[PDB]
Amino acid sequence: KKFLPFQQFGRDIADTTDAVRDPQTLEILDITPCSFGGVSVITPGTNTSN
Amino acid sequence: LVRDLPQGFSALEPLVDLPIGINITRFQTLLALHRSYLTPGDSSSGWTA
Ligand SMILES: *[C@@H]1O[C@H](CO)[C@@H](O)[C@H](O)[C@H]1NC(C)=O
Ligand SMILES: *[C@@H]1O[C@H](CO)[C@@H](O)[C@H](O)[C@H]1NC(C)=O
């Protein structure tokens, strides 16, 4: 992404800051959340096996 | 070849934010005079009328 000289932050979705400009080095880096995901357990009956 | 304001879309990019902190109500535009105020020519001394 290219930030205009006045631009500092990035919000394409308007409720999360996807990208930002580092204050020391003028490179622009984008923030991806640390990820997530549902966890499902597939089990037969405990009357049969655990 | 467009005398008036052209038809189209151009987004204006910011230039600078001056912390002047003053009160502004009126403004005026400064021009450049190529001709002479002491001796005004009959014509063409200025820029194509
Ligand atoms: C800010 O300092 C950093 C680290 O010293 C360096 O990348 C750069 O010289 C400076 N950048 C700016 C914004 O002046
Ligand atoms: C600016 O000046 C006008 C008078 O020309 C006055 O009425 C107005 O209150 C002033 N505004 C500020 C913010 O000083």
From Swiss-Prot, chain A:
Glycans are attached at N47. It comes from the Viruses. Attaches the virion to the cell membrane by interacting with host receptor, initiating the infection. The major receptor is host ACE2. When S2/S2' has been cleaved, binding to the receptor triggers direct fusion at the cell membrane. When S2/S2' has not been cleaved, binding to the receptor results in internalization of the virus by endocytosis using host TFRC and GRM2 and leading to fusion of the virion membrane with the host endosomal membrane. Alternatively, may use NRP1/NRP2 and integrin as entry receptors. Binds to host ACE2. RBD also interacts with the N-linked glycan on 'Asn-90' of ACE2. Cleavage of S generates a polybasic C-terminal sequence on S1 that binds to host Neuropilin-1 (NRP1) and Neuropilin-2 (NRP2) receptors. Interacts with host integrin alpha-5/beta-1 (ITGA5:ITGB1) and with ACE2 in complex with integrin alpha-5/beta-1 (ITGA5:ITGB1). May interact via cytoplasmic c-terminus with M protein. May interact (via N-terminus) with host bilirubin and biliverdin, thereby preventing antibody binding to the SARS-CoV-2 spike NTD via an allosteric mechanism. This is Spike protein S1.
UniProtKB/Swiss-Prot annotation, chain B:
Changing A11V: In strain: 20A.EU1. Changing D4G: In strain: Beta/B.1.351. Changing G46S: In strain: Omicron/BA.2.75. Glycans are attached at N23. Attaches the virion to the cell membrane by interacting with host receptor, initiating the infection. The major receptor is host ACE2. When S2/S2' has been cleaved, binding to the receptor triggers direct fusion at the cell membrane. When S2/S2' has not been cleaved, binding to the receptor results in internalization of the virus by endocytosis using host TFRC and GRM2 and leading to fusion of the virion membrane with the host endosomal membrane. Alternatively, may use NRP1/NRP2 and integrin as entry receptors. Binds to host ACE2. RBD also interacts with the N-linked glycan on 'Asn-90' of ACE2. Cleavage of S generates a polybasic C-terminal sequence on S1 that binds to host Neuropilin-1 (NRP1) and Neuropilin-2 (NRP2) receptors. Interacts with host integrin alpha-5/beta-1 (ITGA5:ITGB1) and with ACE2 in complex with integrin alpha-5/beta-1 (ITGA5:ITGB1). May interact via cytoplasmic c-terminus with M protein. May interact (via N-terminus) with host bilirubin and biliverdin, thereby preventing antibody binding to the SARS-CoV-2 spike NTD via an allosteric mechanism. This is Spike protein S1.
